[PDB]
Design brief:
There is one protein chain. The protein is about 35% helix and about 15% strand. The chain is an alpha+beta fold. The chain has 5 domains: about 5-145, PLAT/LH2 domain (Lipoxygenase-1, Sandwich), CATH 2.60.60.20; about 145-245, Lipoxygenase-1, domain 2, CATH 4.10.375; about 245-335, Lipoxygenase-1, domain 3, CATH 4.10.372; about 335-455, Nuclear Transport Factor 2, Chain: A; about 460-805, Lipoxygenase-1, domain 5. The protein has a 5-stranded antiparallel beta sheet, with no helix packed on it. Helix 8 crosses helix 10. The protein is globular. It binds fe (ii) ion (FE2). Fe (ii) ion binds near residues 466, 471, 661 and 806. Monomer. Its EC number is 1.13.11.12. Keywords: Cytoplasm, Dioxygenase, Fatty acid biosynthesis, Fatty acid metabolism, Iron, Lipid biosynthesis, Lipid metabolism, Metal-binding, Oxidoreductase, Oxylipin biosynthesis. This is Seed linoleate 13S-lipoxygenase-1. It holds the Pfam family PLAT.
Length: about 800
């Protein structure tokens, strides 16, 4: 006669319980088996919360009893109306006697604020052809509400997913100097689309979106947290708007020296800390996320945490071994390419390299031997940076070269830098090779030469490998998924855990990170040209090239070989990011390969899923629309396509992102190791800075790289980005153990979990293998743990999250 239920919810403040009783909250069950005259599932009576059930977290459970006779058949969904003033976070409904589970995880605002009453489905999984008849209209009804109208300013409670270009970064109403090009919607500046906010145009420019205090994301994209400290995405906003101006004020008032004077001054940051004015300390202390980034004395002194790279040797970062090793085991281990001819060539139109083969020490190999056995590699930033060097060098306190670095794979399997080329624009409106050296002024020039390269690499890492390739590239898929795949859909259930916190971090990023005068523009080399440079690189972005084996082959760091376990042979055998990544990759591929056939028996089934098709069509034609005409997009007409798309998406969102994200502070916490900017070119002979370079190599280095003030800001932001929130959900985990009722998916997913821990043991053995020390640890003695699946919270240099979450 009466079905027992239990509602779990969290009050807003966790992210009096009695106030939830009475006629505060009403649920109505919806039948999956018995329909009305129009074929829509029958709806029960308004049923209110009866009492508190006497779990974890800030969660509360409430009892409820539904009238449900045999005429009403089986419940498969429900309506909920919040009559209270304040929104709550709904976790679940559980119906007793099998038991019926509804995983909701959704904010529920006052009923008046919704156009349609909120609906939640049971945890059963269906492709469109398999939805219970009485749930067909409800399902498609919930999708259309999710897509919205494409108009209006989006409000806090809206759950409306739609696309727009990156036209909200510039702030021309404040200043024409803060105008930025629209990125997206043209061939000049192609770019992935982001989540629409509809704030409308600025006064001076109808193409640019006006500023807002809050950058909207659909409501359930903005996760709250039990612990305020875990809202790491918030830290970027407070950094830019509150902390940064406090730092700058500390420098105006002579309270700390404007520049670092020795390397020790930099080591002091994590040691004794830095002395700052009173009001500067009292500013950062109350900030819930920022306060976790430093230690304090209460009144004057702030200290950063000791970066992993310096934890054993404080100077090992300076070695050529470490410089080279970080290209395959560092923060940015995915840019190095095979070089299959000498000298290296450009794809521009003037630009060929001036490095000579004869000048290189290849450990006794000839150049022909090196090329023959594929032992020559390159970090090539020449073509990427040349088109921008003139403009960049026109900025103030910014000077860079377009750099190439030649690498030789030694017999022992380590990388050896053998040349750096530093090029300036050869258009007469205005180009040297540096060889390695251990001693003399030669060694100092080489060291500065290395610094310029890593300035090149830092920018490319932050903006391309990291920002563009993960955050930016992923958002359109998120949007398309909510727009077109029902919460019921198997592929929605597969992919959406890998979108956790993505649109959220990205919105706060557009607001404070990659905006005009934001963190990146005021700390990194290209300044106002930063974001647009990622647009130039997006022109060459290929979705299928993001698949790891494709990536490795494309870069000539691996060849295709069927005889090998993963079907590719590494040309650099102990390439830690690549060797470890292939395990994770393989681990993800098996899971997708097992999950997909559970729901699609043949190619037709993929072709015939109207949701999947509209999804992939919109993701490509709208979401990555500036590239919609490229021939490499998968057609999504077969089983094999579906598997590939899903696998690639899961790869980018979890492992790819983790490998390029969580080494930011561990390697870059020492600014000399990873400078984010260079301020002057090489000193010419007969100049005062030349003598300084002769007489004080440390000062010469510090005067070249990121200034002390922007270092403080840049050190703070990568520290935020490098931390694991205590409520992260890692690869091989789901936030709820009943994410689907399908026992085959559950079991398959559990096998995925087991394989990941097996792999972790394998990586532990790799790190502990003494013969692999050279690449896995190097002179910094820093075990390559960035692709360990598991981690605890904090700055761990390990752990693979499901999604791009920070
Ligand atoms: Fe990130």
């Amino acid at each position: 006669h009466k079905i027992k239920g239990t509602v779990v919810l969290m009050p807003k403040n966790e992210l009096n319980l009695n106030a939830f009783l009475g006629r505060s909250v009403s649920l109505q069950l919806i039948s999956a088996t018995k329909a009305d005259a129009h074929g829509k599932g029958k709806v029960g009576k308004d049923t209110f919360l009866e009492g508190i059930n006497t779990l974890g977290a800030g969660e509360s459970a409430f009892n409820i009893h539904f009238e449900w006779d045999g005429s009403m058949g089986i419940p498969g969904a429900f309506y909920i109306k919040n009559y209270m003033q304040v929104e709550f976070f709904l976790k679940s409904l559980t119906l007793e006697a099998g038991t019926i589970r509804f995983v909701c995880n959704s904010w529920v605002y006052n009923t008046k604020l919704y156009k349609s009453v909120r609906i939640f489905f049971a945890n059963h999984t269906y492709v469109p052809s398999e939805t219970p008849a009485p749930l067909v209209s409800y399902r498609e009804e919930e999708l259309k509400s999710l897509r919205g109208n494409g108009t209006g300013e989006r409000k806090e409670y809206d759950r409306i997913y739609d696309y727009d270009v990156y036209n909200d970064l510039g702030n021309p109403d404040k200043s024409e100097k803060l105008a930025r090009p629209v990125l997206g919607g043209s061939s000049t500046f192609p770019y992935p689309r982001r989540g629409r906010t509809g704030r409308g145009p600025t006064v001076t420019d109808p193409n640019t979106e006006k500023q807002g205090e809050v950058f909207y994301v659909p409501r359930d994209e903005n996760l709250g947290h039990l612990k305020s400290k875990d809202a790491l995405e918030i830290g970027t906003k407070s950094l830019s708007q509150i902390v940064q101006p406090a730092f700058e004020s500390a420098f105006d008032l002579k309270s700390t020296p404007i520049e670092f004077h020795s390397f020790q001054d930099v080591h002091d940051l994590y040691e004794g800390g830095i002395k700052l004015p009173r009001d500067v300390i009292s500013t950062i202390i109350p900030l819930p996320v920022i306060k976790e980034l430093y230690r304090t004395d209460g009144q004057h002194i702030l200290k950063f945490p000791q970066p992993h790279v310096v934890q054993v040797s404080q100077s090992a970062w300076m070695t050529d071994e470490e410089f080279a090793r970080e290209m395959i085991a560092g923060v940015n281990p995915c840019v190095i390419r095979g070089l299959e001819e000498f000298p290296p060539k450009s794809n521009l139109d003037p630009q060929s390299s001036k490095i000579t083969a004869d000048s290189l020490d290849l450990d006794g190999y000839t150049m022909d031997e090196a090329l023959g056995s594929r032992r020559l590699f390159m970090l090539d930033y020449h073509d990427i940076f040349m088109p921008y060097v003139r403009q960049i060098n026109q900025l103030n306190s910014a000077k860079t070269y377009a750099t190439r670095t030649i690498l030789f794979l030694r017999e022992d399997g380590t990388l050896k830098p053998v040349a750096i080329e530093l090029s300036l624009p050869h258009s007469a409106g205005d180009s040297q090779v540096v060889l390695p050296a251990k001693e003399g002024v030669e060694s100092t020039i080489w060291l500065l030469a290395k610094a310029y390269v890593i300035v090149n690499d830092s920018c490319y890492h932050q903006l391309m490998s990291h920002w563009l390739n993960t955050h930016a590239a992923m958002e359109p898929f998120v949007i398309a998924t909510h727009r077109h795949l029902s919460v019921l859909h198997p592929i929605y259930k597969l992919l959406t855990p890998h979108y956790r916190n993505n649109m959220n971090i990205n919105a706060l990023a557009r607001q404070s990170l990659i905006n005009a005068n934001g963190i990146i523009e005021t700390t990194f080399l290209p300044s106002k040209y930063s974001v647009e440079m990622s647009s130039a690189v997006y022109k060459n972005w290929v979705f299928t090239d993001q698949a790891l084996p494709a990536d490795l082959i494309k870069r000539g760091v691996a060849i295709k070989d069927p005889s090998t376990p993963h079907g590719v042979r590494l040309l650099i055998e102990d390439y830690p990011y690549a060797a470890d990544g292939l395990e994770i990759w393989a681990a993800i591929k098996t899971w997708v390969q097992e999950y997909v056939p559970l729901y699609y028996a043949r190619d037709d089934d993929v072709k015939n899923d109207s949701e999947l098709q509209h999804w992939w069509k919109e993701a490509v034609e709208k979401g990555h629309g500036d590239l919609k005409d490229k021939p490499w997009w998968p057609k999504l007409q077969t089983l094999e396509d579906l598997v590939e798309v899903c696998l690639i998406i899961i790869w980018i969102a979890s492992a790819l992102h983790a490998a390029v994200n969580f080494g930011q502070y561990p390697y870059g916490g020492l600014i000399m190791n990873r400078p984010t900017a260079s301020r002057r070119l090489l000193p010419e002979k007969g100049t005062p800075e030349y003598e300084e370079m002769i007489n004080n190599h440390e000062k010469a280095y510090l005067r070249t790289i990121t200034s002390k003030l922007p270092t403080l800001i840049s050190l703070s932001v990568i520290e935020i980005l490098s931390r694991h929130a205590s409520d992260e959900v890692y690869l091989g985990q789901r936030d709820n153990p009943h994410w689907t009722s399908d026992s085959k998916a559950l079991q398959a997913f559990q096998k995925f979990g087991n394989k990941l821990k097996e792999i972790e043991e394998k990586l532990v053995r790799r790190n502990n293998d003494p013969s692999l020390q050279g690449n896995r640890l190097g002179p910094v003695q820093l075990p390559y743990t960035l692709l360990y699946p598991s981690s605890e919270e904090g700055l761990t240099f390990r752990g693979i999250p499901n999604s791009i979450s920070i």
